[PDB]
């Protein structure tokens, strides 16, 4: 049954709560973004109202076959009334279509739910500016100081330069990029752009990208694998066996693979700068793990929360152990006391 941190008290609303059957008292179900841990439960048989972004709506309709009558897309940065309550959707800087939700409760309390987010200083000049917030439901994925990683811009610079160098030295090299969900599309799009290629993929992945409102997408992607020198593969295929196997299918067209496995944080970020990253290599195959994050670093999270100054914080990630909960509460207290409060 539905946990407390997914219910919005004083309303009939839940957030990312589709795996518990019919939730008692819920008149509208919000979905922050199209990642499987968050949408788990939605299908053609769902018959309650779903509120979400336009992009999330396109994915519900086309990938999950949710009926059009139950999909309620809302524009961003716009005051909307849903079942007698004012709400706003804001860009979460996570994956395409991902939002944060501001709820203005009938009693005067204001709640921000971040969904999944990568905090950025630009959020300090959204509709959040000068908005008192009484409760923050916070994506705490990386709420500990050891979690460091580079900017997305720096990671993309490394990937572009690495790919362009390799293919310029060897015009018969193939570039492969791993994927298992939406998000991190800039990795493969930026590489293909520098190489003057479309990105080749399966019919199923092509379908998914066609839902994302990316400008000029028809010019960037294709299902014709033979015409492309940047290929997308499921993430589980990005290993020496899987890549060797893939190289056979291309019909003696290529003699080297350079592959990228986008990850979240990993322990090697503690020691190695993004510039100094080296691949795993076996013969003519090389694999780069690159830390492209769509969640806040510890420092980004701390900056956002110290700016917002919420009265109370409810974590939504790492909530399962006493140690995790204790650690997170200690950091929130440090941040408050530090800020002069
Ligand atoms: C619950 O944890 C925090 C964490 C950071 C904070 C930073 C600044 C202020 C507060 C609480 C007081 N808010 C006002 C507007 O007076 C924080 C509370
Ligand atoms: Ni997510």
UniProtKB/Swiss-Prot annotation:
The chain holds residues 700 to 1040 of 1040 of the full protein. May be required for DNA interstrand cross-link repair. Also required for checkpoint mediated cell cycle arrest in early prophase in response to mitotic spindle poisons. Possesses beta-lactamase activity, catalyzing the hydrolysis of penicillin G and nitrocefin. Exhibits no activity towards other beta-lactam antibiotic classes including cephalosporins (cefotaxime) and carbapenems (imipenem). Induction: During mitosis. The mRNA encoding this protein contains an internal ribosome entry site (IRES) in its 5'-UTR. This 5'-UTR generally suppresses translation while specifically promoting expression during mitosis, when cap-dependent translation may be impaired. This is DNA cross-link repair 1A protein. It is found in: Nucleus. Expressed in brain, heart, kidney, liver, pancreas, placenta and skeletal muscle. Binds constitutively to TP53BP1. Binds CDC27, which is itself a component of the anaphase promoting complex (APC). Binds PIAS1. Belongs to the DNA repair metallo-beta-lactamase (DRMBL) family.
């Amino acid at each position: 049954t539905c946990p407390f941190y997914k219910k919005i008290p004083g309303t009939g609303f839940t957030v990312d709560a589709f795996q518990y059957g019919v939730v008692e008292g819920c008149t509208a179900y919000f979905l922050t973004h199209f990642h499987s841990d968050h949408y788990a439960g939605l299908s053609k048989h769902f018959t309650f109202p779903v509120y979400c972004s336009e992009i999330t709506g396109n994915l519900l309709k086309n990938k999950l076959h949710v009926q059009e009558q139950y999909i309620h897309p809302l524009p961003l940065d716009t005051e909307c009334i849903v079942n007698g309550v004012k709400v706003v959707l804001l860009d979460a800087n996570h994956c395409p279509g991902a939002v944060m939700i501001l709820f203005y409760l009938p009693n005067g309390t204001v709640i921000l739910h971040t969904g999944d987010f990568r905090a950025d200083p630009s959020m300090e000049r959204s509709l959040l500016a000068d908005q008192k917030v009484h409760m923050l439901y916070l994506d705490t994925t990386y709420c500990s100081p050891e979690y460091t990683f580079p900017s997305q811009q720096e990671v993309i610079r490394f990937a572009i330069n690495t790919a362009f160098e390799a293919v310029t030295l060897n015009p018969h090299a193939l570039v492969v990029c791993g994927t298992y969900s939406i998000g991190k599309e800039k990795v493969f799009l930026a590489i293909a752009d520098v190489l003057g290629s479309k990105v080749g993929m399966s019919q199923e992945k092509y379908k998914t990208l066609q839902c994302l409102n990316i400008p000029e997408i028809n010019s960037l992607i294709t299902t014709d694998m033979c015409s492309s020198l940047v290929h997308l593969l499921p993430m589980m295929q990005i290993n020496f066996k899987g890549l060797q196997s893939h190289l056979k299918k291309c019909g003696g067209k290529y003699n080297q693979i350079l592959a990228f496995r986008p990850t979240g944080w990993t322990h090697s970020n503690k020691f190695t700068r993004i510039a100094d990253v080296i691949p795993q290599t076996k013969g003519n195959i090389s694999i780069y793990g690159i830390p492209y994050s769509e969640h806040s670093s510890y420092l980004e999270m701390k900056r956002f929360v110290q700016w917002l100054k919420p009265q109370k914080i409810i974590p939504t990630v790492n909530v399962g152990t006493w140690k995790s909960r204790s650690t997170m509460e200690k950091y929130f207290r440090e941040w408050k006391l530090e800020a002069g409060y």
